[model samples]
Target: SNPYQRGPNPTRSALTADGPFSVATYTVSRLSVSGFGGGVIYYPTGTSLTFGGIAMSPGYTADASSLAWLGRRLASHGFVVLVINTNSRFDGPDSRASQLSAALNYLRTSSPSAVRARLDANRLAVAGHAMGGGGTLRIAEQNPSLKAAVPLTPWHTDKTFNTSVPVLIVGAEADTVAPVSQHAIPFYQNLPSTTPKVYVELCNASHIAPNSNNAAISVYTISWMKLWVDNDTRYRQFLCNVNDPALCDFRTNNRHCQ
Candidate 1:
């Protein structure tokens, strides 16, 4: 009968060191619950970063394993990352929003005084995988403060799109769990025309491409964050455009996009 349940079902954890970075896991708290506390890890020296995990089936933990890799990648680029575990076993917009709020609170208040000082809260971004990807879009819609969003193989449904901030929708042409047409396409089309957006369809790749297997995807993702989050224009050369066919990947037989 009650939508919010505390004490955790399948999501709940603290921030931990993965090598040179930090991460946290969150769970769905009942609506009546006051706070959904989580954790964050910081590198000895780099930018501060945060990430939210996507929901699985009965117990939300789809991309749980990817957080570690993500942490290392972000830390290598001078960022202290935060990976949130939203409050739901199955990805839902409302739950994601609440978790986003919790993460915001953590970053705003609970972070180490020194770490917080180095963070550019204005540059905060949200990203997710599968259901989490859709949730990320939902959170962005509700929170315009997000600098950018990257949704990996998101499961699109109504109200999962529309945002003024720049967005990167990475879809797998070979993913079966969240097919591109059923999820990725609609989410991509719904992006606000006024904001910068890019849809990259990786050829012969699956949802796992962005997380594991391919180093290219990780490189591209880091470049993306650097461009928008760090405001580093040096990586602008990797962006997609009509003039540069190679850069756009639309002409390449291996990978194509608009």
Candidate 2:
């Protein structure tokens, strides 16, 4: 019996649908923050239980709205989710990395009392898309204390990384902007094999796939967060022995899952 586990035992359908928690939202003004632009925080309502936190950023030239659906979706599933805006849409991964860190800090220390009350400051994760995704990796590499990291269709000139943070790198097979062959795959391969990691490539999808609502992305990403962030092994069912039509490739060295 795990104290961190939330929601009922997950089903394939339930992972895509909203969980038992009612969702609420808060908008963080850019003027009120530093190190990052500003963004909306989506959180589960009612319940004294403290949930793990997650901060997500959008791709180059995109605002937090691109990942808004995901933030809400994850919130309803019981995480305090913040879809963050970069200080500049054109900002690169390093800046985005700092912004993501700030976003998480905001969640832990700066968010409104109600939002702060619901968050477990120690249990956190980061995720992003395209350039933002690249930043997700950078932050995880630098902040190894993070429970997990998910970089969706990431883009960065550097292909290699070394971090103990458990990662789930989502790649789009048809992405020309940050092709998996170069970015996601190499990023996954270069991480030390001992690191708990997984790579999932969306079949026939594009770089913007994570920007929208897609069950393929949701199921795996949520499972990764649940498994790592919440330390919920019950979510493992969705991660291993995967047979999904939306995914063209899946690989992992998680050791815990077969």
TM-score: which candidate is best? 2
What's model 1's overall lDDT?
A: 0.54
Q: Give me the runs in candidate 1 sitting further than 4 Å from their true place.
A: 1-60, 91-93, 241-258
Provide the RMSD of all predictions against the true structure, rounded to 1 decimal: 11.0, 1.1
Report the C-alpha lDDT of model 1 over 1-258, residue by residue, as the tens digit: 321111112110111112233323232224423343243343334323332211111113543445556645554444546655445455564565566566665665665666565565555776666766776777778778776777777765563466776777777888887788787777776666666777777777776665653444454555556566655554454654434221222221112122
Error of 1 at 245 (Å): 11
RMSD of 1: 11.0
Candidate 2 residues lying further than 4 Å off, grouped into runs, are: none
Error of 1 at 112 (Å): 2.6
Weakest lDDT window of 10 consecutive positions for candidate 2: 249-258
